[PDB]
Amino acid sequence: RRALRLGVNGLPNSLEPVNAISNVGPRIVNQIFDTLIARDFFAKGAPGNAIDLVPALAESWERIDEKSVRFKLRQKVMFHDGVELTADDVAYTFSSERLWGPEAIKKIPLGKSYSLDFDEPVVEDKYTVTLRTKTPSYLIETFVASWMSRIVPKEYYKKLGAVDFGNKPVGTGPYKFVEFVAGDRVVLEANDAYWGPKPTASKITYQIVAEPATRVAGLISGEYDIITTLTPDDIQLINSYPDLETRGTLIENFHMFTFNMNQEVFKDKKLRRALALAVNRPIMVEALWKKQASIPAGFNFPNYGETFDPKRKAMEYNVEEAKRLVKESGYDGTPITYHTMGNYYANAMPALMMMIEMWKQIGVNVVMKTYAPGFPPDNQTWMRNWSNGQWMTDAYATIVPEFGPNGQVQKRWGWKAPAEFNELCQKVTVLPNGKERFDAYNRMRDIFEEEAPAVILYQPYDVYAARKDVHWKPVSFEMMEFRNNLSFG
Numbered sequence: 001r002r003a004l005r006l007g008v009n010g011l012p013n014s015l016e017p018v019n020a021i022s023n024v025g026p027r028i029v030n031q032i033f034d035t036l037i038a039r040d041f042f043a044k045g046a047p048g049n050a051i052d053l054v055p056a057l058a059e060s061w062e063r064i065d066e067k068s069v070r071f072k073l074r075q076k077v078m079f080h081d082g083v084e085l086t087a088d089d090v091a092y093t094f095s096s097e098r099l100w101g102p103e104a105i106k107k108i109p110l111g112k113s114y115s116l117d118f119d120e121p122v123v124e125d126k127y128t129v130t131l132r133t134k135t136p137s138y139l140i141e142t143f144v145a146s147w148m149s150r151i152v153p154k155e156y157y158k159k160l161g162a163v164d165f166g167n168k169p170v171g172t173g174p175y176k177f178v179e180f181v182a183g184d185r186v187v188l189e190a191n192d193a194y195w196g197p198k199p200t201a202s203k204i205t206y207q208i209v210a211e212p213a214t215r216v217a218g219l220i221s222g223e224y225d226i227i228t229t230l231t232p233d234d235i236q237l238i239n240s241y242p243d244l245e246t247r248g249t250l251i252e253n254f255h256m257f258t259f260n261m262n263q264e265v266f267k268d269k270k271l272r273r274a275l276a277l278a279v280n281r282p283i284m285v286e287a288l289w290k291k292q293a294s295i296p297a298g299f300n301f302p303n304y305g306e307t308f309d310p311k312r313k314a315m316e317y318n319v320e321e322a323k324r325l326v327k328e329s330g331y332d333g334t335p336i337t338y339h340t341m342g343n344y345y346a347n348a349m350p351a352l353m354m355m356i357e358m359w360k361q362i363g364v365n366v367v368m369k370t371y372a373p374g375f376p377p378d379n380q381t382w383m384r385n386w387s388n389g390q391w392m393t394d395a396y397a398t399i400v401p402e403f404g405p406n407g408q409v410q411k412r413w414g415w416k417a418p419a420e421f422n423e424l425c426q427k428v429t430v431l432p433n434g435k436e437r438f439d440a441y442n443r444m445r446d447i448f449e450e451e452a453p454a455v456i457l458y459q460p461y462d463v464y465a466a467r468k469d470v471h472w473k474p475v476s477f478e479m480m481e482f483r484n485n486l487s488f489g
């Protein structure tokens with residue numbers, strides 16, 4: 001079998017499933033682990049954007065009450081170390097001790113915030129586990145299909161510990177772990193004891209090539225089979241090669257810039273909203289994205305389904321109001337730092353370059369500050385770029401896990417969110433779908449735009465480039481799927 005060589009924008013600091021949640025982690029962890037329920041992006045001939053939930057580690061599942069889902073596990077499934085997967089492994093993945101409990105903050109810092117109001121799971125037998133919540137939650141199934149729900153082995157994980165497990169992971173996935181050289185590569189080999197769609201590559205190498213130019217030149221050479229995180233400006237050149245092509249898709253993610261509200265200059269919404277109101281997103285989509293990116297109407301995405309508002313007005317663009325807000329704010333004229341990790345996010349640097357000029361024309365002076373892969377101290381950062389993968393078929397993620405009263409934007413970044421925002425966050429968690437929940441999400445979307453804790457830029461069009469003899473198609477998520485989606489020749 002052929003060894004797959006990948007040229008990537010970055011690598012996660014840990015291969016622990018939850019700690020790996022990023023634009024760079026899922027493409028690796030999806031090969032090491034499996035979930036109970038899997039999303040089949042290619043269901044009913046869809047171009048890698050289907051929302052259909054299929055059985056994976058769980059052969060079948062059933063909803064008992066408004067707060068619990070039972071899982072009937074697939075039998076004789078093995079972890080890479082040779083240990084058999086049981087209800088105890090699933091119970092440990094969703095346990096207080098490891099994920100959502102107070103003691104889990106040392107293992108997985110974002111576990112509690114990204115999790116549902118979980119209760120300790122119920123093991124019924126070797127292949128039967130009930131996942132439950134303390135309060136009603138109709139979000140169990142979507143969470144179970146997410147990047148939060150990759151099954152870890154209890155015994156091996158407990159022996160090693162979260163930090164050590166992240167450097168030497170063991171899962172049930174189609175690709176076992178081989179080696180991890182920080183700031184260099186991640187090597188995975190074919191797991192031929194795999195239960196499902198069998199591995200087609202003998203090995204997979206995730207090689208970091210931080211500079212997109214070096215990455216393209218690498219594919220042309222040809223050092224790599226598939227390269228990630230390109231810009232639609234790379235389409236013309238790559239496609240002009242007979243053996244090469246680009247493969248792109250709009251991903252269920254949004255690029256953004258956020259503030260450190262612990263800093264005196266960003267304590268008031270005045271300057272934050274002024275920066276948001278000066279952002280001309282349509283020219284950014286023309287200049288940098290060549291029409292390929294999508295501008296959402298606020299914290300609203302179609303993957304929310306019943307909680308998506310298609311009648312929602314576009315985010316306000318008002319240069320004159322922005323000027324007024326800068327003047328009303330306490331902003332003196334002191335340069336404000338904007339932190340970026342080169343081009344970890346596609347078009348990160350050209351986007352900031354454009355925005356610095358937009359902000360200059362409103363009275364704000366913004367300065368670029370770059371940081372090497374792996375982040376500066378919180379107190380040393382003012383403005384910074386970020387992204388949020390909308391990991392649920394509901395509006396809960398990411399407005400609640402990231403911007404909620406138990407989330408990192410308020411607790412770590414110091415956003416003094418209005419009481420009304422936090423109250424609605426509690427309702428949407430517990431309530432079923434209806435007018436109350438729909439309007440609750442809409443008022444939160446209105447509060448988010450008024451407060452400006454973060455400024456949504458656009459939905460990036462993910463651009464990959466591969467060798468034509470490598471048959472792989474992208475999915476509408478910040479991950480790569482190779483299950484029934486990888487062949488050579």
Ligand SMILES: O=P(O)(O[C@@H]1[C@@H](O)[C@@H](O)CO[C@H]1O)O[C@@H]1[C@@H](CO)O[C@@](CO)(O[C@H]2O[C@H](CO)[C@H](O)[C@@H](O)[C@H]2O)[C@H]1O
Binds near residue numbers: 373398
């Ligand atoms: O990749 P991100 O956009 O990940 C998002 C998540 O933060 C979450 O909001 C849900 O959607 C995802 O898209 O952002 C990175 C974030 C993730 O940990 O932290 C940053 C900050 O610099 O990157 C660090 O973590 C990475 C993972 O270990 C990364 O490999 C590393 O280079 C770090 O800098 C951010 O880019």
